Amino acid sequence: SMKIDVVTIFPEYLQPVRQPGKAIDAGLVDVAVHDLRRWTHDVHKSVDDSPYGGGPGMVMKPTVWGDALDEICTSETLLVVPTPAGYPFTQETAWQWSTEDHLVIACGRYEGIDQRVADDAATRMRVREVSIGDYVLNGGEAAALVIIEAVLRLVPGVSLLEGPSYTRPPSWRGMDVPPVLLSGDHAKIAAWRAEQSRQRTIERRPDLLGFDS
Amino acid sequence: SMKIDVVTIFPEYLQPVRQSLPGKAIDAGLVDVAVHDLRRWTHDVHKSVDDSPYGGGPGMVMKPTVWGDALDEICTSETLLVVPTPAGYPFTQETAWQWSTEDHLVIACGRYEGIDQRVADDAATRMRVREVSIGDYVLNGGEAAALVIIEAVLRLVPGVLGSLLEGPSYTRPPSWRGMDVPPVLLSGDHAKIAAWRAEQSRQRTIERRPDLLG
Numbered sequence: 471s472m473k474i475d476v477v478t479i480f481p482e483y484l485q486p487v488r489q490p491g492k493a494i495d496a497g498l499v500d501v502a503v504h505d506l507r508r509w510t511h512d513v514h515k516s517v518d519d520s521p522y523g524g525g526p527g528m529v530m531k532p533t534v535w536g537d538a539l540d541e542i543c544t545s546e547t548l549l550v551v552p553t554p555a556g557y558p559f560t561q562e563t564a565w566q567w568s569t570e571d572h573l574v575i576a577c578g579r580y581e582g583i584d585q586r587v588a589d590d591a592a593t594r595m596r597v598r599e600v601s602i603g604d605y606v607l608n609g610g611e612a613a614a615l616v617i618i619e620a621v622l623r624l625v626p627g628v629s630l631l632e633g634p635s636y637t638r639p640p641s642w643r644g645m646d647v648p649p650v651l652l653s654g655d656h657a658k659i660a661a662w663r664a665e666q667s668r669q670r671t672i673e674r675r676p677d678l679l680g681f682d683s
Numbered sequence: 684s685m686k687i688d689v690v691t692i693f694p695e696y697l698q699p700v701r702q703s704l705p706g707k708a709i710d711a712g713l714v715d716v717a718v719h720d721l722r723r724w725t726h727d728v729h730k731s732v733d734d735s736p737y738g739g740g741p742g743m744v745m746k747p748t749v750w751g752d753a754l755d756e757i758c759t760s761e762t763l764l765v766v767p768t769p770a771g772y773p774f775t776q777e778t779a780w781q782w783s784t785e786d787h788l789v790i791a792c793g794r795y796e797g798i799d800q801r802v803a804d805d806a807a808t809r810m811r812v813r814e815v816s817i818g819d820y821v822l823n824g825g826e827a828a829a830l831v832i833i834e835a836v837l838r839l840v841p842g843v844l845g846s847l848l849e850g851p852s853y854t855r856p857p858s859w860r861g862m863d864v865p866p867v868l869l870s871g872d873h874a875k876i877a878a879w880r881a882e883q884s885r886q887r888t889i890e891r892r893p894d895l896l897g
């Protein structure tokens with residue numbers, strides 16, 4: 471069983487998590503979404519301020535985050551902070567996190583979260599700053615959705631690129647399913663599929679096989 | 684001015700990003716995101732979208748006749764057809780920049796073990812097709828990848844927003860739970876601040892992303 475808390479200033483953006491939806495329905499995992507502004511005290515509910523040292527944009531204040539995480543996290547929590555400057559989130563990471571009791575995902579907006587939030591949390595719990603890929607999102611919420619989906623499907627009770635797949639009809643718009651796939655010859659099918667995967671990995675992801683680019 | 688059509692068997696997944704678009708950008712006709720239920724193009728009363736894989740194996744494959752009809756209706760010769768797949772080329776910020784100038788993106792969201800390959804192969808004979816992965820992890824389907832792609836692309840579209848890793852950022856208060864903001868940031872020596880940030884970036888990139896440094 472796993473508990474996931476997501477903290478965000480846009481809780482409505484996390485609704486796609488209800489599809490993970492079937493997983494929540496079957497009660498293996500519970501996912502709860504929290505509005506960060508719940509932990510503000512001024513009437514303007516401010517969560518951001520200009521950066522020390524200058525630069526464009528705003529930084530999320532540590533005070534509000536600290537109060538939220540104080541309430542939501544325990545010492546057993548794995549605190550996950552999406553950020554383009556994070557360690558890479560990979561399938562290995564997803565396997566690792568799949569056996570955790572409690573994930574808390576802190577979703578940043580603006581130019582990021584004051585670094586002391588993660589630093590303070592790390593004195594009490596395990597903290598993981600991670601990137602889901604080399605592109606810029608408008609905030610951590612889409613990353614949270616990717617992480618949740620990748621992790622939940624590995625929870626107990628829920629190399630080379632995959633080649634092309636085919637299903638019926640065997641001829642469509644004058645394009646035939648590769649004949650070997652209709653042959654029923656398991657050895658020849660396995661071989662053809664390995665060759666397809668090789669071509670595809672070399673072409674699209676040569677890095678996976680230890681080649682440049 | 685970009686139109687994005689997304690085709691999926693879970694259209695509700697994409698509704699929050701649809702509603703997150705700034706009214707001003709929609710009012711100015713800079714952007715439109717439309718989401719379509721793939722089952723609109725099914726042929727049978729059971730609204731079947733998948734079938735068993737030729738050659739055997741686990742899971743199911745999405746039917747080419749259904750996808751073929753959907754894309755026939757939605758795509759034109761000017762369309763850039765995006766197909767999220769773990770077997771794709773990597774989607775990066777460079778990709779997002781390239782696609783941000785397109786008039787029409789169509790994102791085909793697959794489930795199970797993928798879409799019959801003839802769908803993309805046939806589409807590629809009359810439009811540009813891009814199979815892409817958003818990272819090295821497995822999702823249940825393409826919807827979360829579509830969300831990522833839509834966000835990354837649209838924030839580059841002129842209007843809709845109205846190397847090395849970045850280092851740490853700080854804001855008020857100057858002291859918090861025993862941790863001080865690095866005094867250099869308060870120094871008013873902006874050449875020194877820039878050099879400090881550069882070194883923080885170098886150290887963080889070495890620690891977290893050595894791949895970025897050859």
Ligand SMILES: NC(=O)c1ccc2[nH]ccc2c1
Nearest residue numbers: 552553554601602607609610
């Ligand atoms: N690529 C990422 O993982 C990423 C990019 C931008 C972001 N902004 C807030 C969180 C976040 C994550």
Ligand SMILES: NC(=O)c1ccc2[nH]ccc2c1
Nearest residue numbers: 767768769816817822824825
């Ligand atoms: N990592 C990806 O981009 C990814 C993983 C699994 C998927 N299933 C369907 C589309 C898709 C994309």
